[PDB]
Amino acid sequence: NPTKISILGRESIIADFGLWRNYVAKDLISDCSSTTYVLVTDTNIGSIYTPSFEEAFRKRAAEITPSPRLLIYNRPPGEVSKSRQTKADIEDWMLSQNPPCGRDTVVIALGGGVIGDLTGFVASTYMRGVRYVQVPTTLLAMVDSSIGGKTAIDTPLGKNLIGAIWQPTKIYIDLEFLETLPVREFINGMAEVIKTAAISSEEEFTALEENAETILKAVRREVTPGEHRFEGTEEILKARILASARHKAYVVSADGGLRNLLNWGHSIGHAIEAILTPQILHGECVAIGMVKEAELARHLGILKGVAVSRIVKCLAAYGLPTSLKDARIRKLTAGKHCSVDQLMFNMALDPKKKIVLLSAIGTPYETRASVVANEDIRVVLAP
Amino acid sequence: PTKISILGRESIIADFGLWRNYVAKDLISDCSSTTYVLVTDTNIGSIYTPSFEEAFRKRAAEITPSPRLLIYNRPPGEVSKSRQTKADIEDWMLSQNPPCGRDTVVIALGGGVIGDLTGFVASTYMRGVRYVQVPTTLLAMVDSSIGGKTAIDTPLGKNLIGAIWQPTKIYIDLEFLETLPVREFINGMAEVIKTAAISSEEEFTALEENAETILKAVRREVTPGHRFEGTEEILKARILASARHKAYVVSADGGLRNLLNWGHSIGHAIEAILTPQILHGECVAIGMVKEAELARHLGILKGVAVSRIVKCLAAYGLPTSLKDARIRKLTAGKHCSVDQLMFNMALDPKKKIVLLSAIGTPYETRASVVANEDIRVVLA
Numbered sequence: 033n034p035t036k037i038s039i040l041g042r043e044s045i046i047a048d049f050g051l052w053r054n055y056v057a058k059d060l061i062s063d064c065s066s067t068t069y070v071l072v073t074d075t076n077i078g079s080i081y082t083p084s085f086e087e088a089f090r091k092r093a094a095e096i097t098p099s100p101r102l103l104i105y106n107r108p109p110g111e112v113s114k115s116r117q118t119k120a121d122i123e124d125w126m127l128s129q130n131p132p133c134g135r136d137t138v139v140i141a142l143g144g145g146v147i148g149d150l151t152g153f154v155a156s157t158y159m160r161g162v163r164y165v166q167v168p169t170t171l172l173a174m175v176d177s178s179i180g181g182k183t184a185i186d187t188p189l190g191k192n193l194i195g196a197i198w199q200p201t202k203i204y205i206d207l208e209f210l211e212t213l214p215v216r217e218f219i220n221g222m223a224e225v226i227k228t229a230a231i232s233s234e235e236e237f238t239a240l241e242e243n244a245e246t247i248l249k250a251v252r253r254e255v256t257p258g259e260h261r262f263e264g265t266e267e268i269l270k271a272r273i274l275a276s277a278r279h280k281a282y283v284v285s286a287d288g289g290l291r292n293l294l295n296w297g298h299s300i301g302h303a304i305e306a307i308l309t310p311q312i313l314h315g316e317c318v319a320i321g322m323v324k325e326a327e328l329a330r331h332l333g334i335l336k337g338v339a340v341s342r343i344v345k346c347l348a349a350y351g352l353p354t355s356l357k358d359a360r361i362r363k364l365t366a367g368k369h370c371s372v373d374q375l376m377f378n379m380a381l382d383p384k385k386k387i388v389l390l391s392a393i394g395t396p397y398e399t400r401a402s403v404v405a406n407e408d409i410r411v412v413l414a415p
Numbered sequence: 416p417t418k419i420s421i422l423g424r425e426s427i428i429a430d431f432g433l434w435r436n437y438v439a440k441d442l443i444s445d446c447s448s449t450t451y452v453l454v455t456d457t458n459i460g461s462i463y464t465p466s467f468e469e470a471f472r473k474r475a476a477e478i479t480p481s482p483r484l485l486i487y488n489r490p491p492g493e494v495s496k497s498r499q500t501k502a503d504i505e506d507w508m509l510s511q512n513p514p515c516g517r518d519t520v521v522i523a524l525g526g527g528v529i530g531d532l533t534g535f536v537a538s539t540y541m542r543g544v545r546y547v548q549v550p551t552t553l554l555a556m557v558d559s560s561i562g563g564k565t566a567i568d569t570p571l572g573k574n575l576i577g578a579i580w581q582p583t584k585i586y587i588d589l590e591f592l593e594t595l596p597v598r599e600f601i602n603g604m605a606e607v608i609k610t611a612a613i614s615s616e617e618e619f620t621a622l623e624e625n626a627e628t629i630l631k632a633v634r635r636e637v638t639p640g641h642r643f644e645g646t647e648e649i650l651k652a653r654i655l656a657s658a659r660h661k662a663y664v665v666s667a668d669g670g671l672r673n674l675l676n677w678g679h680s681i682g683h684a685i686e687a688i689l690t691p692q693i694l695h696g697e698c699v700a701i702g703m704v705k706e707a708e709l710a711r712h713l714g715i716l717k718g719v720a721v722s723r724i725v726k727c728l729a730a731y732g733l734p735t736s737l738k739d740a741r742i743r744k745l746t747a748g749k750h751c752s753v754d755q756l757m758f759n760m761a762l763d764p765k766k767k768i769v770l771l772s773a774i775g776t777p778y779e780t781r782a783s784v785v786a787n788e789d790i791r792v793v794l795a
C-alpha cells in the first residue's frame with residue numbers, strides 16, 4: 033500500500049513500489065483532471081521508463097471520454113539542460129502543439145534534480161503558472177530536490193540564479209526507479225538521507241547504521257532475470273528513505289530558521305563543491321562537509337567526539353567519502369586540491385559564517401545555523 | 416496622498432507628483448533595501464529618469480549606509496516584452512558590482528509593457544524579489560498595473576510566458592498624464608469607462624458630464640509652465656474610480672472578476688485583426704458597443720443605455736464602429752468578417768460574454784453564455 037505524506041498541509045507525496053507502472057497514470061487523470069499531459073525527462077532516464085508510461089497512460093487514458101493526450105519531451109542529460117534556452121524550447125514546443133498546450137495542462141517532471149528544477153520552473157511560468165507533479169528518479173531528488181517547490185535554471189554566471197517557488201500538485205515516489213539508478217548516484221543521494229537523520233532522530237540515524245550493509249549490497253547486487261533489485265529489503269529501504277522525505281516535508285511545512293537545519297554539512301560542503309565540481313558530486317562533497325562541520329562542533333566544545341566518529345563511520349559505511357584526501361577522489365581529479373583560502377573564500381560567496389552545529393546526533397545546537405568565527409573554521413580545515 | 420488598498424493591505428498610493436517628491440523617500444522607508452533597479456523605456460525614461468536620480472540621491476544620501484540606484488533603459492514598444500529583453504536585464508543585474516541581490520527592489524516605470532516585463536523579471540530573479548508599479552499610461556494606472564499579472568510575448572502569442580507577482584507598492588502619479596500622448600490617454604479611457612459601466616451608474620454619469628472638461632485639458636496644447644491645473648479633482652476622481660474598482664474586484668479575489676472583460680470578448684477578436692495599427696482601448700471601445708448591442712438584442716439591456724454608452728465613448732474620442740473613418744485609414748484593407756471574428760473569439764466553442772442589465776448593473780455576477788448565432792448578428 034502507498035504511503036501518503038503531506039506538504040504545506042495538503043495531500044502531495046504518495047510513495048510505494050512501482051507506482052509508475054500502475055498508479056500515476058490513473059491518479060493523474062483522476063485528481064489532476066486535464067486534457068493535456070506534458071512529460072519531460074532526459075534521454076537517459078526517458079528511454080528506460082518512457083515506454084512503460086505511454087502504455088499505462090493510453091490505458092487509463094482511453095478508459096475515459098473524451099480521452100486526454102500525452103505529449104513527451106526528451107532533453108539531453110546533464111546539468112547543462114537547466115538553462116534559459118531549453119526552458120524556452122520546452123515552452124515553444126508546447127505552444128507549438130496542435131492544439132497548443134493550454135492552461136489546463138498538467139506537466140510531469142520525470143527525473144532527477146535537473147529535470148525537476150527545470151520542468152518545475154517551466155510550469156511555474158507557462159501562462160503564468162500551470163499544474164505539475166514530481167516523479168523523482170534519483171535518490172536525492174526523492175528525499176530533497178523534489179520537495180519544497182524550489183525550481184530554477186543555471187546561468188553562465190551561476191547556478192540556480194533564475195527560477196521560482198512553485199509547489200507540485202503531487203509528488204509521486206516510486207522506489208523502483210532506484211533499481212536502474214547508477215550506484216554512484218544512489219550513494220550520492222544517501223548523503224542527504226543521513227544528513228536528515230543526523231539533525232532529527234537519533235533512532236533514525238542508528239537504524240541507518242544497521243541497514244547499511246543490507247541496503248548497500250542490494251544496490252550493488254546482480255539482478256537475476258525475473259527479479260526486482262530490492263526484493264526482501266523493501267521495508268527497510270522504503271522506511272529509511274521516507275524518513276528523510278518525511279522530515280524535509282515537515283521542515284518545509286514549518287519554515288527563516290528551522291529550515292536552516294537542512295543545510296548541515298552544506299555550509300562547508302558547497303565551498304568544497306565549488307572546487308571539486310563537476311568531477312565530484314554534491315552528496316559526495318556534502319558528506320565530507322558533514323564530517324568537517326561535525327568536527328567543528330566538537331572543536332567548539334558542543335559536539336561529543338564520540339558522535340563525530342559515529343557520523344564518519346555511517347557515511348563511509350554507505351560508500352560516502354570522509355576526507356578531502358580520499359584516495360578515490362584523488363584519482364578522479366589529478367591536479368586539484370582545496371586550499372584553505374579557497375575554501376574560506378568560496379564560503380564567503382553566500383567575517384563570521386552561519387553553520388548548523390550539532391549538539392548531539394539527532395539534536396542540533398540551535399533551531400537554526402549558528403555564527404562561527406572564521407578563525408575556528410580555519411582550524412578544522414587546517415591539515 | 417490618497418491610498419487605495421488591494422488584497423487587504425494598502426499598496427496603491429495616488430496623488431499628483433508623487434514621483435518628484437514621495438516615491439524615493441517612501442521606498443527607502445517601507446521597501447528598505449541597498450539596491451534599487453529602475454527599468455523603463457528610452458521614451459518615458461528620458462522624460463522622467465533625471466528627476467528621480469535627483470529625488471533618489473536626495474533621500475538616499477540622507478541615510479547610512481546609502482543605497483544605490485541602478486537604471487535600465489529598454490527600447491519602446493511591445494517588442495521589449497521578450498524572452499530576450501528580460502534575459503538582458505537579468506544578466507545586467509547579475510553583472511553588477513556587486514551583483515544585484517535578493518534584497519533588491521525593482522521599480523517598473525512605464526506603461527503596460529514595461530510593467531508586465533519588469534514585473535515578471537522580478538517574479539523570477541532569484542525566485543522572486545520585491546518590486547513596485549509606477550504606471551505612466553492611463554490604462555496601466557487603472558488596469559495593467561493592478562493585480563500582479565506579468566508576462567512576456569512569444570512569436571507564437573502574447574502573454575504566453577509569465578507569472579502572478581504582486582507589487583509591494585503601486586505609485587500613481589497623475590502628472591505622468593501630462594506628457595502622455597493624447598491617443599494614448601483616449602486609449603486608456605476605454606477601461607475607465609468599462610469600469611464604471613459595470614459598477615456604478617453615478618460614476619458613468621459623472622464621466623459623461625466631465626467629458627468636455629477632461630478632454631480639453633488633454634487635446635489642449637499646454638504653453639510652457641501644468642496640464643491639468645484646475646481639473647485635478649475631476650480627473651483624479653474619475654481615474655481612481657476605476658483603479659479603486661479594479662482594486663476591489665481583485666481583492667474580492669471566478670465571478671465578479673470576469674466582469675472586467677466587458678467589451679473584451681469581442682474587443683479581442685477585433686484586436687487580433689486591427690492590431691497593431693489600432694490600439695487596445697480602441698478595439699475594446701467598439702467591442703463594448705457591440706457587446707452592449709448584444710445585451711439589448713437578448714432583451715436584457717435597454718436600448719436607451721446602448722446609445723448612452725456609444726455617446727460617452729465617442730464623447731471621449733473613442734471609436735464606436737468598425738466603420739469609423741479614423742480607423743479605416745490606419746486599417747485600409749483589413750476588414751473583420753463575421754467568421755473571422757467568430758474564429759478569433761474561439762481562441763479564448765460556446766461563447767461567454769459580460770452582459771449589462773443596465774448601465775451600472777451587470778446581468779449576472781460574471782460572464783453569461785451566449786449563442787454563437789446571436790453573436791453573429793451584432794457583428795456585420
Ligand SMILES: NC(=O)c1ccc[n+]([C@@H]2O[C@H](COP(=O)([O-])OP(=O)(O)OC[C@H]3O[C@@H](n4cnc5c(N)ncnc54)[C@H](O)[C@@H]3O)[C@@H](O)[C@H]2O)c1
Binds near residue numbers: 076109179214
Ligand atoms: N530543493 C531543490 O530544488 C534542489 C535541492 C538540491 C539540489 N537541487 C538540484 O539537484 C540537481 C542534482 O540532481 P541529482 O543529484 O538528482 O542528479 P541528476 O538530475 O543529474 O541525475 C543523475 C543522473 O541519473 C540519471 N538517472 C536518473 N534517474 C535514473 C534511474 N533511475 N536509472 C538510470 N539513470 C537515472 C540521469 O540521466 C543523470 O545522469 C542539481 O542540478 C541542483 O540544481 C535542487
Ligand SMILES: NC(=O)c1ccc[n+]([C@@H]2O[C@H](COP(=O)([O-])OP(=O)(O)OC[C@H]3O[C@@H](n4cnc5c(N)ncnc54)[C@H](O)[C@@H]3O)[C@@H](O)[C@H]2O)c1
Binds near residue numbers: 551
Ligand atoms: N497585467 C495586466 O493585467 C494587463 C492588462 C491590460 C493590458 N496589459 C498589457 O499592457 C500592454 C499595453 O500597455 P500600454 O497600453 O500601457 O502601452 P505602452 O506601454 O506601449 O505605452 C504606449 C506608448 O507611450 C509611451 N509612454 C508611456 N507613458 C508615457 C507618458 N505618460 N509620457 C510619455 N510617453 C509615454 C511609451 O514609450 C509607449 O511608446 C500590453 O502589452 C498588454 O499585454 C496588461
Ligand SMILES: [Cl-]
Binds near residue numbers: 100101102103
Ligand atoms: Cl497520446
Ligand SMILES: [Cl-]
Binds near residue numbers: 135136
Ligand atoms: Cl485547472
Ligand SMILES: [Cl-]
Ligand atoms: Cl538555495
Ligand SMILES: [Cl-]
Binds near residue numbers: 199200201
Ligand atoms: Cl498545490
Ligand SMILES: [Cl-]
Binds near residue numbers: 264
Ligand atoms: Cl534478503
Ligand SMILES: [Cl-]
Binds near residue numbers: 308310
Ligand atoms: Cl573544475
Ligand SMILES: [Cl-]
Binds near residue numbers: 333334
Ligand atoms: Cl557536551
Ligand SMILES: [Cl-]
Binds near residue numbers: 374
Ligand atoms: Cl583564493
Ligand SMILES: [Cl-]
Binds near residue numbers: 486487488489
Ligand atoms: Cl541599459
Ligand SMILES: [Cl-]
Binds near residue numbers: 491492493
Ligand atoms: Cl515603438
Ligand SMILES: [Cl-]
Binds near residue numbers: 189
Ligand atoms: Cl551572481
Ligand SMILES: [Cl-]
Binds near residue numbers: 510
Ligand atoms: Cl554595466
Ligand SMILES: [Cl-]
Binds near residue numbers: 581582583
Ligand atoms: Cl506581497
Ligand SMILES: [Cl-]
Binds near residue numbers: 688
Ligand atoms: Cl486575426
